[PDB]
Enzyme design. Structure first.
Site, short mmCIF file in Angstrom:
data_model
loop_
_atom_site.label_atom_id
_atom_site.label_comp_id
_atom_site.label_asym_id
_atom_site.label_seq_id
_atom_site.Cartn_x
_atom_site.Cartn_y
_atom_site.Cartn_z
N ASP A 162 29.22 0.57 -36.36
CA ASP A 162 28.69 1.93 -36.25
C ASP A 162 27.32 2.07 -36.92
OD1 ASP A 162 30.97 2.76 -34.96
OD2 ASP A 162 31.95 3.49 -36.80
N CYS A 188 37.88 -0.02 -35.70
CA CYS A 188 37.02 0.23 -36.86
C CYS A 188 37.56 -0.42 -38.13
CB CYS A 188 36.85 1.72 -37.10
SG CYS A 188 36.11 2.58 -35.73
N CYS A 210 32.81 2.13 -39.49
CA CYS A 210 32.83 0.66 -39.52
C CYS A 210 31.42 0.09 -39.53
CB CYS A 210 33.63 0.07 -38.36
SG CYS A 210 32.81 0.20 -36.77
#
EC number: 4.99.1.2
Length: 205
Positions: free
Chosen positions: A96, A156, A93
């Protein structure tokens, strides 16, 4: 910090299983080499018994494994996603991509497409800042992590890049069934990532 609820819930997903936090950084650093990682290699790097390594991983239901059962995906992944993370790896995602460079101590060239419009977006993420943000007005969606839910599905899959804040808010307006859905600027999102990492590192033994 009005992003504190997101940081708290993010860290909650980590702090619960005793070892997860200490396993995270070593695993990302390995995955960042670009090859599958065995439970025994990981165990050697952490100086843990394999039983402990397996325990922590069992809690992380989204973990991706290759045909031999080597780990290939844990936030950072060898398997293609919408989030390109070049140091050519991929991330689960948008958030991240903002957090990992500091943890692995590398600068990453990140690219994706706007979730609302399909337009190309890119930026360079270092441990301390984001640069070359294109388009300048780039935005990120956040949802509140749901404790015990599959992290990849509940979090995510809803955490995207957008070409602009207004474009993202327009998109958010059609997705109000998502828990704690919020649009922030990419710079705001990076700051959230910094807060997350600052706490994560304190809780590492």
């Amino acid at each position: 910090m009005k992003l504190a609820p997101y940081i708290l819930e993010l860290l909650t997903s980590v702090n619960r299983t005793n070892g997860t936090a200490d396993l995270l950084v070593p695993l990302l650093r390995e995955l960042a080499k670009g090859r599958p990682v065995s439970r025994t290699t990981l165990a050697g790097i952490l100086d843990w018994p394999a039983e402990r390594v397996a325990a922590v991983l069992e809690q992380a239901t989204s973990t991706e494994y290759d045909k031999d059962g080597n780990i290939i995906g844990y936030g950072l992944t060898l398997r293609e996603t919408s989030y390109v993370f070049e140091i050519r790896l991929y991330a689960w995602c948008a958030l991240d991509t903002l957090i990992f460079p500091a943890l692995i101590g590398r600068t990453a060239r990140v690219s994706s497409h706007c979730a609302a419009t399909g337009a190309p977006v890119s930026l360079t993420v270092s441990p301390s800042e984001i640069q070359a943000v294109e388009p300048a007005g780039m935005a990120v969606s956040l949802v509140l992590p749901q404790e015990a839910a599959d992290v990849r599905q509940s979090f995510c899959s809803h955490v995207h890049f957008f070409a602009s804040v207004p474009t993202a808010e327009d998109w958010a307006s059609k997705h109000q069934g998502l828990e704690g859905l919020a649009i922030v600027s990419v710079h705001e999102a990076f700051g959230l990532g910094q807060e997350f990492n600052r706490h994560l590192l304190q809780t590492m033994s």
